[PDB]
């Protein structure tokens, strides 16, 4: 029961830097890579063996590769507070940036470092004996995330095949975005995410900013504040493979349970209770309230109002002391509500997993310790809004053939530009056809 992580691009590496901290803290691993001696917390002789190895003489090493082209972030990690945690070879850094150029990141520069990245993946996966699947973190708003990421997905799907790939992909926010040429890279990376990932959990930025300014009450957030709760979501998703519980849910039925069609796999993610250290003890936090807060429209990591379409399949992971009775009652109330309508062909919509490990907490965070937590991964039909919204502002650029020379100077073609355009068209058409 071991799972490996690959981090591609600035966003991926930064989220991984804010996630492996949580992982080592949750399993009690000291930042230098070895557990302490006298202090003893929990029983985890194989509860650590999923994300970490053990190099014989008490020195755990994560099953993850960070990789970048701009070596600044990678050597920042190499000189950071986690010099010893990582292996000195799982941190791959090329020479020159991709510079918001999918073509430069996928064709010219990308094709000279993936050969080393996937070789490292090979001689990393040879060390396991119960491999489950991969999970990728990337932003499609740039070059390394889109280009090198798509190349690595291609050359890993062709190599390892059947194994699942949990993508955690950052789409651009609708109107807030640093990069400007990013719609091109978004469509180009979509035309590879659609046919090479089994489950693609989407993440946005305006949605998370809204969450951390309405519930968490932090009016000037930052990436160190976004990646912490993204890591919270990842940990809540993958807790079951590390911790026993009343009802354990592993990675196979996230696909055999939330993906009704070979191509309709796009997850809205939510997490409750996103709470501060002042409202926490003053609020009575039980299963019904945390579930309602999870299901409210303005609690999704992606900015789309999940009232336009219907829910196809919801999966609720509970951490902490939760009994089956009250969670069953809560999902019954959720069904009884009048705001959300489920799709017709799927009468039973939810799958609830439970685990006895309470949510962790990072000293210096905003989310205070709580007894329980819920994380929802929902396959819905309200993502056509997002895809069409990105499509319109891709077309606006493409009409004038602006910025296209930067792509054709590295190897792109208007052929595949129009190919990705019609691919998005087909995807949104499929959403429209399946909604009915």
């Amino acid at each position: 029961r071991e799972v490996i992580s690959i981090h591609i691009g600035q966003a991926g590496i930064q989220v991984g830097n804010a996630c492996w901290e949580l992982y080592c803290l949750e399993h009690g691993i000291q930042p230098d890579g070895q557990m302490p001696s006298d202090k003893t917390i929990g029983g985890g002789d194989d509860a650590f063996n999923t994300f970490f190895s053990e190099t014989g003489a008490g020195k755990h090493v994560p099953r993850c590769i960070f990789l970048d082209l701009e070596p600044t972030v990678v050597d920042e990690v190499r000189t950071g507070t986690y010099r010893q945690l990582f292996h000195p070879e799982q941190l791959i850094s090329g020479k020159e940036d991709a510079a918001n150029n999918f073509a430069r990141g996928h064709y010219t520069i990308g094709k000279e470092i993936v050969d080393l990245a996937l070789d490292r993946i090979r001689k990393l996966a040879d060390n396991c004996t119960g491999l489950q699947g991969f999970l990728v973190f990337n932003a499609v708003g740039g070059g390394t995330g889109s280009g090198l990421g798509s190349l690595l997905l291609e050359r890993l799907s062709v190599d390892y095949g059947k194994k699942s790939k949990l993508g955690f992909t950052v789409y651009p926010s609708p109107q807030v975005s640093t990069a400007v040429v990013e719609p091109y890279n978004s469509v180009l990376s979509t035309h590879s995410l659609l046919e090479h990932t089994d489950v693609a959990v989407m993440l946005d930025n305006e949605a998370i900013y809204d969450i951390c300014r309405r519930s968490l009450d932090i009016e000037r957030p930052t990436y160190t504040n976004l990646n912490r709760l993204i890591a919270q979501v990842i940990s809540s998703l993958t807790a079951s493979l590390r911790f026993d519980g009343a009802l354990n849910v592993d990675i196979t039925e996230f696909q055999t349970n939330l993906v009704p069609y070979p191509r309709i796999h796009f997850m809205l993610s939510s997490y409750a209770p996103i709470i501060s250290a002042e409202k926490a003890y003053h609020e009575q936090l039980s299963v019904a309230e945390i579930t309602n807060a999870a299901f409210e429209p303005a609690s999704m990591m992606v900015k789309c109002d999940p009232r336009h379409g219907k829910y196809m399949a919801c999966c609720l992971m509970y951490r902490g002391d939760v009994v089956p009775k009250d969670v069953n009652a809560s999902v019954a109330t959720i069904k009884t509500k009048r705001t959300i309508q489920f799709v017709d062909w799927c009468p039973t919509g939810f799958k609830c997993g439970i685990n006895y490990q309470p949510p962790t907490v990072v000293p210096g965070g905003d989310l205070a310790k709580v007894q329980r937590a819920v994380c929802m991964i929902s396959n819905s039909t309200a993502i056509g809004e997002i895809f069409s919204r990105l499509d319109h502002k891709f077309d606006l650029m493409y009409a004038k053939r602006a910025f296209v020379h930067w792509y054709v100077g590295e190897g792109m073609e208007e052929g595949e530009f129009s190919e990705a355009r019609e691919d998005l068209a087909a995807l949104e058409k499929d959403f429209e056809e399946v909604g009915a």
């Binding site: 004038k400 053939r401 054709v408 100077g409 073609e413 208007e414 052929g415």
Partner: protein
């Protein structure tokens, strides 16, 4: 020379067909496995030139359509109620401003007529309209080349059109 979005659509589609034929010939050449990308870049630059020419034609067509449709609205402002008769009179004044004011004397005469007509209401717009009329009158009386009074004449025409496109000043403008 296009004027309709349909004709622009025809031009766009024939250009795209030309692009496809050119790239198909380049591909079916099946040669120059290193100059292929340079030929592609040159083809894209050609495409950019033609698209910019289409953009220029689009700007010209948009301006000419705007002028033609303003004239059309003025005509629909005529097709014998007293309000419609006043509308016809204002259309005459606007056509007098539109026509090439080749003669300084007729220019001054029509400016005098429009100033008399405008000075009746005098709420807020007539202040700047009269200021511009006096500006043109003075810069013609002292003697300056009318070819240098182009933007100012354009501004007078625009303000007069805005005056006409007003309910109280033209007591039928509720139509549009």
């Amino acid at each position: 020379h296009p004027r309709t979005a349909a004709d622009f659509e025809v031009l766009y589609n024939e250009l795209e067909a030309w692009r496809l034929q050119e790239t198909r010939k380049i591909k079916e050449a099946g040669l120059a496995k290193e100059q292929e990308q340079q030929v592609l870049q040159q083809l894209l630059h050609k495409e950019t030139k033609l698209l910019q020419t289409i953009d220029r034609l689009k700007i010209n067509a948009n301006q000419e359509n705007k002028e033609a449709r303003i004239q059309h609205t003025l005509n629909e402002m005529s097709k014998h109620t007293p309000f419609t008769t006043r509308a016809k009179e204002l259309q005459q004044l606007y056509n007098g401003l539109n026509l090439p004011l080749l003669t300084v004397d007729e220019r001054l005469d029509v400016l005098l007529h429009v100033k008399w007509t405008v000075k009746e209401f005098d709420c807020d717009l007539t202040r700047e309209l009269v200021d511009l009329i006096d500006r043109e009158a003075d810069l013609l009386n002292r003697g300056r080349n009318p070819k240098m009074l182009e933007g100012l004449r354009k501004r007078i025409s625009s303000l007069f059109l805005n005056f006409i496109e007003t309910p109280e000043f033209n007591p039928e403008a509720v139509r549009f």
